[PDB]
Design a protein around this ligand. Structure first.
Ligand SMILES: CC(C)(COP(=O)(O)OP(=O)(O)OC[C@H]1O[C@@H](n2cnc3c(N)ncnc32)[C@@H](O)[C@@H]1OP(=O)(O)O)[C@@H](O)C(=O)NCCC(=O)NCCSCC(=O)Nc1ccn([C@@H]2O[C@H](CO)[C@H](O)[C@@H]2O)c(=O)n1
Ligand SMILES: CC(C)(COP(=O)(O)OP(=O)(O)OC[C@H]1O[C@@H](n2cnc3c(N)ncnc32)[C@@H](O)[C@@H]1OP(=O)(O)O)[C@@H](O)C(=O)NCCC(=O)NCCSCC(=O)Nc1ccn([C@@H]2O[C@H](CO)[C@H](O)[C@@H]2O)c(=O)n1
Ligand SMILES: Nc1ncnc2c1ncn2[C@@H]1O[C@H](COP(=O)(O)OP(=O)(O)O)[C@@H](O)[C@H]1O
Ligand SMILES: Nc1ncnc2c1ncn2[C@@H]1O[C@H](COP(=O)(O)OP(=O)(O)O)[C@@H](O)[C@H]1O
Ligand SMILES: [Mg+2]
Ligand SMILES: [Mg+2]
Lengths: 814, 814
């Protein structure tokens, strides 16, 4: 009955220092352990006894659940507990706790609380090393069905590296694996006269401005010194009543940026501001901002339903998303929430607050800048953070624009004390925090990369920090995908290195093997709507082209490829791609972490393919490596604003590249017609490059060569009066509005190869002809895009039409 | 040397009563007459000696011009003197004074002034009856070259009907033609104690609110009692601080609506309003509104460059047009000018002022209404007024919408006393102020219609009041065009009437004869860019179709046709049109004003044509009368927002209607391709009706009948994989985004007649197919236009594609 003395000792130390505690329970009676832990935690303190959070998948204790406020949440509903604070968190089903769930469920516990994780009944702790998960179902494919678990090995291996983690059994017995069995009791403090220096500084900052309003009443809301300084900077910018200011605030997750900006909004309202606009990537990012706006209003003695009213958008799915707040104390004032694409409504703005400015595409932010006062906040680390390259681009653009720019930072968290052990363990576990010709490609073994060896861990952090430097929002589920995928392989590009020194990864490539689908399943899928969706390239070309022979081949999909942000644009990605291609072409004739390519026999593959969001810079890189386009989605992505593009390369050695020419020619014929449906927005050059690349890739089939245009076929397209109209226009005797129904036919004649060899056009003429004929654009829209006067775009368009007319006349007369 | 006593008597009476005087000078030394008149006018009064305005075309007096402020203006620059006030106006060149110039140059003279008109040296006053004008050059054509002047006859005949008009010679001698030779001197008044009742009422209204602010200081700006009441209503609406009000103000031209609204804007600014928006058809309508806004600011003790700043749009042509005003007294306030199509920026508005609301198309006004406070002003009579039908529609819609609506009116002018004689004469001269089967068409003689006989004048006013009832802005130049055109004819539709009673005009038709152009001139024009532009239908079809045989025919153009607004939609316009057509088909086997059709032999004409702005209601009326479309402009009209459409009917009796089938078929082939260029905006039904009408009119040529589609031609359009994709979509195994490049081909196949007889489609299916295939519209845009859910529009579109697929399969297999 005597409880081990280390449990209350650790709980008391956490309560004294205001830091969390981690407990892992193994057995079939975890209810008693949780009850005992809660009793021990509650019997020591009274200021920290908040609600208890419980998270699960689908499914004394009886008295315990009937005495405390328990919020029950599903693993899929964890987005609803955002912004709360709990005194205890419980996770029940170990089988389905993805890293995304784990990051969210733990950050909502204040200092001094308990984090309890429940494990199913076991006899030995080694059965988790390969236990099946609820996510492995999506991993399995027809070709590959055996999946080896590696995340759960690292999860138990990392428990011994935490100094605040205790692992106990049903009978409350400490286990050797626990990394906090050496904790000694802390000396009892005396705070009767002793006070922390930070507390004294905070009290002094609050007191020196008590006699001033409204800042004196508002400053009583801050909890950290950095929060107080950020509020001081915001209020100093606001009260200056000059709209030539900009403040950018960057910090980790949980430092207090949203609350600070919310209180600054109330200060701005109290200072006489009328037009206030708030933008964010998602309306779920403003939940605490709009709470602290109302907290500031309450601290300013405003009354509800008499001084302000709240307008809430009930109709869409986000019912709780506030959209508008009206204030009628002295004169009418409003606070409006808009989308980042609605920059045309900011003509009369006075204050625009951009929450999560790093996760917004840069041109949208560039268009949201005006001649007024701007507040920006961004996340640089922690869960859902932004890659360093995007942040560097954002701050570089802001510095280029400058108007006064002031940058501030926050360090100390709010819910728990700085230097918390559980936060450090979580950041570690999820990784949340030479001449090119001389480089060499290597294969990284995944059995030892996830073995928690110090060298392997040091390399894994470097690779993950490499491949997430361009994400808009860091996601820790890709770590589990990389670890537990059955067919994924990792390749790293290193320079010349010596023995005993780990090479620094210049580039990293992740590849997946796809293909080899039985024709019975392809026929079943092509005759119905169901699709396993295990693969991406086999299952898309078959549906788009209604073909049954492509999905039976073998190929590789490049899931991810990323180089060092400091080493970009110097030739390493191309070298790594070429080396991988040569490896798969048979050009090279505790296991060690690094294996040379010459020591392993490659696979026999027919093609290699990639899927990415279309951009000119990325398309040029992929086209230089001999990739040809096959697909281009019509609906743009909401998170970025780009269309998915698929490219395939026929890398097979000594085989006929004819099955790909048909696909390329079909795509080329579809793109010309589809330029009017949702591809009207594309810049002319971007569509021109895709058309040129598809036409060049369609030449892999010699039967796809174009044929000339004869007089007999021409007479079936243009009547003699059409010829007369074209001739009159070419001589300058007609307006260009008259000969405008003939543009699609001439464009289709030129861009399909019939007229290509007869008349030659430059790049600018090709772009103008493509736009006018296939995208149906106006002359004034063309003038803006090309940065040329409108009266000059027509001058070069009359030269396209007086070269075609001569050929038509020679063909008809001859 | 002794001046006639009637001149100073009339001048003194005008000065006493505050009314203008009209003088006409004939001779070669009008300088001395003008000098004497100015001296006589100035020697009596001192409070009215303002600047002298001089208007001319191209080209003691020496001392006279060097002592007074004279503003010299050109006849083409009369738009620059808008809003001013002068004490004397002079018109020099009688040869080019169009009615539009005459209306503008006279309204800017305050009461008590002089209006002097100069006439060239003459021996008899009868030479003006047929004197050539500077406008007659545009009237002459190749076919008709003799023009008879009639406006100058009426101008001299109406001078004798004015009681304030004197006609004098070089030696200052009164002429019998003068209509004010019987004026007797007025008794000398005594205003030492006597005051006008209106002046007493105005003083009382000003005084009873002196102690209140800011209305007490602002009310000192009004000049009439009606202006004061309008300002009181505006300020009462503003100070209520409830945004559920609307005030509509209607009056003649010169009553004080713009100034009243300008002062109300200053009151709103002083009452704490932040967002204020001003819209108008043209930025030249706000010249006095923005002047009185600044006058109110000055009366409110605001200081320039310290309390407000003015932002002016220098870059466009309208440099003087103010676009934005910023106020920073207590908190930032602004006043913005927007275009009527910019209703999307009014999300945060508090006061929207719509000047000249009748001249704006009704849907724009309907979209400018919001949940805020609206001020409207409109012109109902006088120069540049709006027809009564448009105003009735506007007020009926406003009453339907209602929110509180309050309507006010102004009667008494500002610059001159009410009951002015010159204003009455100007309004008179320029006309600024049964079963259908039993009706009969008549021809109106223009030699007696403009002879100033009382009966002829009474009928002319009734006709002009008929044909201007739908104009957005009344223009008095059309009166001169109707009077002096060499080939124009007027027809009126009257019911059964008795002798001695003038019939009431139910409908009026104006026709012009066009055609008969020598082929030499047509060849010269078609081989260059120059065009006489005398005709409209011959000179447009020849250029659009590059044809040389149409312009040599003979035809009639219906310039105007309008019925009684109270008798609309009851069958009179159709009856008049049919009777005119039968008259021109040879179906009928001081001169009197009315001539029966049976008494005159018609002309031999091949076609009849009309040009109008496209609308569904007008297109249906014209199509019912067997008219076929030939042209449709691509650029919309700025004043209305509609595209010009041309329709022609082959009315010739017993001739081949084959020259028109070619034009109709060419237009039908151009419209299908041009639906993507600027006709994407058209509603589906409106384009469908035009396509159906053009296809039906193209059948006048039997060689234009369509042919069936054969398997050989089908195999040259769709590959077997395209057939497989279409079949898969028809069975519900594909997304509609996949088979979307095939839509233009199917639409062109169906709407050109190849597939029309094989597969039958209803009206809704035809509209959806036309939109999706030829206009490239989205599904969500289609759902809004058709007032149907988006998920139901697709359900009926999958029925179009499973009828075409079966025919294609039968054609291929068979
Ligand atoms: C290209 C690169 C790897 C090596 O390039 P290098 O450094 O090695 O440059 P190199 O010397 O070889 O040649 C010089 C030439 O490269 C060009 N170039 C030069 N600098 C840049 C630059 N900074 N950026 C771009 N191109 C550049 C060119 O400008 C220059 O032309 P030029 O000189 O010859 O003038 C390296 O740039 C890089 O990190 N690129 C970005 C990271 C990445 O992974 N790229 C490969 C992507 S595919 C797998 C993949 O992930 N697909 C996706 C993507 C999104 N999504 C969804 O979208 C959402 C998120 O978005 C959502 O989350 C979801 O994810 C998805 O589902 N699947
Ligand atoms: C149609 C009408 C005469 C006789 O029609 P009826 O009274 O007779 O009606 P009816 O019994 O015969 O048959 C019933 C059928 O008529 C229809 N219908 C019934 N009510 C209405 C209605 N209220 N309006 C419309 N259609 C209606 C239908 O709805 C119904 O179909 P439904 O039942 O069988 O259901 C008589 O409506 C009317 O005033 N329409 C307007 C005045 C006018 O002149 N119209 C002829 C125009 S061409 C010459 C001309 O001027 N061209 C231009 C025009 C503009 N511009 C430039 O644009 C600027 C200005 O905009 C710029 O200033 C410049 O001017 C230009 O340069 N040259
Ligand atoms: N001044 C404050 N007073 C009380 N609670 C606060 C204060 N500032 C932050 N918090 C709490 O701490 C959390 C901070 O999260 P937040 O600062 O919104 O994240 P981010 O760093 O992304 O802005 C909030 O959930 C809020 O409940
Ligand atoms: N209260 C006033 N004080 C002085 N002048 C005025 C006043 N109201 C109007 N006016 C003069 O009379 C003219 C009235 O024209 P306006 O009222 O703008 O025409 P509308 O009737 O179309 O609004 C203006 O040119 C202005 O100079
Ligand atoms: Mg935030
Ligand atoms: Mg006006």
């Amino acid at each position: 009955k005597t409880v081990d003395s280390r449990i209350p000792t650790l709980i008391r130390n956490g309560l004294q220092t205001k830091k969390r505690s981690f407990f892992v329970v193994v057995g079939d009676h975890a209810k008693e352990a949780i009850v005992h832990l809660y009793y021990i935690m509650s019997s020591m303190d009274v200021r920290q006894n908040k609600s208890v959070l419980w998270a699960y998948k689908k499914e004394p204790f009886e008295l315990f659940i009937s005495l405390n406020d328990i919020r029950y949440c599903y693993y899929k509903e964890t987005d609803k507990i955002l912004g709360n604070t709990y005194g205890m968190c419980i996770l029940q089903d170990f089988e389905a706790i993805t890293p995304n769930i784990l990051a969210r469920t733990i950050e909502t516990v204040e200092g001094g609380g308990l984090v309890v994780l429940l494990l199913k009944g076991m006899t030995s702790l080694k059965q988790l090393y390969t236990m099946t998960m609820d996510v492995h179902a999506r991993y399995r494919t027809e070709a590959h069905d055996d999946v080896i678990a590696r995340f759960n090995e690292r999860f138990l291996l990392s428990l011994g590296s935490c100094e605040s983690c205790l692992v106990i059994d049903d009978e409350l017995n400490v286990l050797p694996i626990s990394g906090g069995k050496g904790v000694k009791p802390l000396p009892p403090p005396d705070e009767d006269e002793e006070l922390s220096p930070a507390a004294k500084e905070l009290k002094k900052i609050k007191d020196e401005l008590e006699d001033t309003q409204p800042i004196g009443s508002l400053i009583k809301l801050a909890r950290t010194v950095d929060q107080a300084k950020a509020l001081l900077t915001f209020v100093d910018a606001i009260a200056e009543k000059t709209l030539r200011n900009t403040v950018t605030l960057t910090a980790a997750r949980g430092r207090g940026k949203s609350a600070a900006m919310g209180v600054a909004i109330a200060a701005a309202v109290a200072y006489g501001y009328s037009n206030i606009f708030i933008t964010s990537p998602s309306p779920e990012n403003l939940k605490t901002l709009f709470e602290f706006v109302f907290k500031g209003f309450d601290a300013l003695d405003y009354k509800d339903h008499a001084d302000y009213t709240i307008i809430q958008s009930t109709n869409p799915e986000f019912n709780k998303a506030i959209v508008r707040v009206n204030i009628h104390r002295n004169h009418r004032q409003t606070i409006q929430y808009i989308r980042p694409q609605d920059a045309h409504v900011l003509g009369q703005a006075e204050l625009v607050v951009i929450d999560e400015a790093a996760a917004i595409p840069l041109p949208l932010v560039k268009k949201l800048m005006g001649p007024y006062l701007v507040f920006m906040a961004s996340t640089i680390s922690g869960y859902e953070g932004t890659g360093r390259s995007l942040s560097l681009k954002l701050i570089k653009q802001l510095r280029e624009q400058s108007r006064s720019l002031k940058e501030i930072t926050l360090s100390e968290p709010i819910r728990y004390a700085q230097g918390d052990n559980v936060e450090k363990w979580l950041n570690t576990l999820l990784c949340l925090d030479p001449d090119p010709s001389q480089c060499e490609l290597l294969h990284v073994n995944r059995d030892t990369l996830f073995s928690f060896h110090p060298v392997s861990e040091k390399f894994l952090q470097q690779m993950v920090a490499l491949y997430v430097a361009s994400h808009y929002k860091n996601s820790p589920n890709d770590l589990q995908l990389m670890s537990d995928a059955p067919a994924h392989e990792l390749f790293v590009l290193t320079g010349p290195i010596q023995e005993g020194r780990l090479p620094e990864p210049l580039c990293v490539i992740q590849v997946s093997l796809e293909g080899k689908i039985s024709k019975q399943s392809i026929l079943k899928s092509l005759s119905r709507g169901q699709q396993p969706a295990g693969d991406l390239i086999p299952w898309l070309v078959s549906q788009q082209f209604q073909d049954d022979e492509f999905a039976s081949l073998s190929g590789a999909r490049i899931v991810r490829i990323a180089t060092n942000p400091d080493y970009m644009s110097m030739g390493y990605g191309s070298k790594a791609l070429q080396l991988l291609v040569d490896y798969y072409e048979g050009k090279f004739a505790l296991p060690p972490l690094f294996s040379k390519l010459s020591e392993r026999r490659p696979e026999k593959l027919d093609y290699v393919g990639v899927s990415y969001g279309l951009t000119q810079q990325l398309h040029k890189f992929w086209k230089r490596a001999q990739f040809v386009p096959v697909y281009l989605r019509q609906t743009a992505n909401d998170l970025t604003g780009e269309h998915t593009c698929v490219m395939i390369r026929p890398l097979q050695d000594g085989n006929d590249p004819s099955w790909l020419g048909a696909f390329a020619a079909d795509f080329h014929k579809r793109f010309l017609s589809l330029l009017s449906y949702k591809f009207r927005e594309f810049p002319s050059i971007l569509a021109l490059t895709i058309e040129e690349s598809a036409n060049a890739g369609a030449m892999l089939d010699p039967s796809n060569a174009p044929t000339e245009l004869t007089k007999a076929e021409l007479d079936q397209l243009f009547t003699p009066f059409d010829h007369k109209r074209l001739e009159s226009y070419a001589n300058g005797l007609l307006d260009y509005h008259v000969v405008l129904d003939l543009m699609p036919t001439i464009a289709q004649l030129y861009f399909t190869g019939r007229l290509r060899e007869a008349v030659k056009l430059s790049g600018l003429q090709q772009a103008i002809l493509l736009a006018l004929g296939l995208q149906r654009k106006d002359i004034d829209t063309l003038a803006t895009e090309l940065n040329l006067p409108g009266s000059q775009v027509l001058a070069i368009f009359m030269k396209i039409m007086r070269k075609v007319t001569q050929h038509f006349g020679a063909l008809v007369s001859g």
